[PDB]
């Protein structure tokens, strides 16, 4: 009987797209890392993988759960918020929503 956990990812929250005062660019998204506060800690996670995991209505190939894949590109600002590029822009309803950030590819 274990009684432990299984988390191998770092929690993140998709906040918004890269944007100005008016215009928003859905090409890149802004991700807040759990526990990252500064640019050096962000630079640790640059290049790391990221998955937006959601659920749908129809099971297509054995699962009702769909994923969107991407990677961290560069730090954003001084807060450690990271800029992320995905295979497809995020659904824009996932503003303030959970993403799983994977430590592969790893260099440590």
């Amino acid at each position: 009987p274990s009684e432990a956990g299984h988390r191998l990812y770092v929690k993140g929250r998709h906040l918004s797209y890269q944007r100005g005062r008016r215009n928003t660019h859905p090409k890149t998204s802004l991700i807040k890392i759990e526990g990252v506060d500064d640019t050096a800690a962000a630079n640790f996670y640059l290049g790391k993988r990221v998955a937006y995991v959601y659920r749908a209505q129809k099971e297509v190939r054995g699962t009702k759960i769909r994923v969107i894949w991407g990677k961290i590109t560069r730090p954003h600002g001084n807060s450690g918020v990271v800029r992320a590029k995905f295979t497809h822009p995020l659904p824009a309803r996932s503003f303030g929503a959970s993403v799983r950030i994977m430590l592969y590819p790893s260099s440590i």
């Binding site: 956990g5 988390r7 191998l8 770092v10 526990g35 994977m102 430590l103 592969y104 790893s106």
Partner: protein, 143 residues
């Protein structure tokens, strides 16, 4: 960070978040690792450097058959029969392990556990699974 005979944490795949020992470093990002099998259930297998994490703990590798290791490291040991097992398997039954894999795994892990049981609680550490627990920040922690 990775040397012949070092404990790594596999992060992805069937054995995700689990500690094994890297034995030999193959080419094009391929690493030959073993559990050992009798310790944590991981057999002789090859994984990817970009998906492992190298831990500073070094296991005493003296007493292992390097000829056996590189004989296994020859680039057919898995793919040569992979098609045979795929055809054989596809009420459900576990498909049999090859006798060659069984013999080499037995020799290698016999030597490896003989070396491992010297340092304290290393067997338990290798059998235990890796996990991140609230407040654990990978960007600062030393492995």
């Amino acid at each position: 960070s990775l040397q012949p005979g070092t404990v790594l944490i596999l992060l992805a795949g069937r054995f995700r978040g689990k500690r094994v020992v890297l034995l030999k470093c193959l080419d094009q990002g391929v690493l030959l690792v073993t559990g050992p099998f009798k310790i944590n259930g991981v057999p002789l297998r090859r994984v990817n450097a970009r998906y492992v994490i190298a831990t500073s703990v070094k296991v005493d590798l003296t007493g292992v058959d390097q000829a056996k290791i590189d004989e296994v490291a020859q680039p057919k040991y898995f793919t040569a029969e992979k098609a045979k097992e795929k055809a054989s398997e596809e009420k459900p039954q576990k498909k049999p392990v090859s006798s060659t894999r069984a013999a080499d795994q037995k020799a290698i892990d016999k030597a490896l556990i003989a070396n491992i049981k010297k340092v304290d609680m290393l067997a338990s550490y290798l059998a235990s699974s890796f996990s991140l627990r609230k407040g654990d920040k990978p960007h600062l922690m030393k492995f």
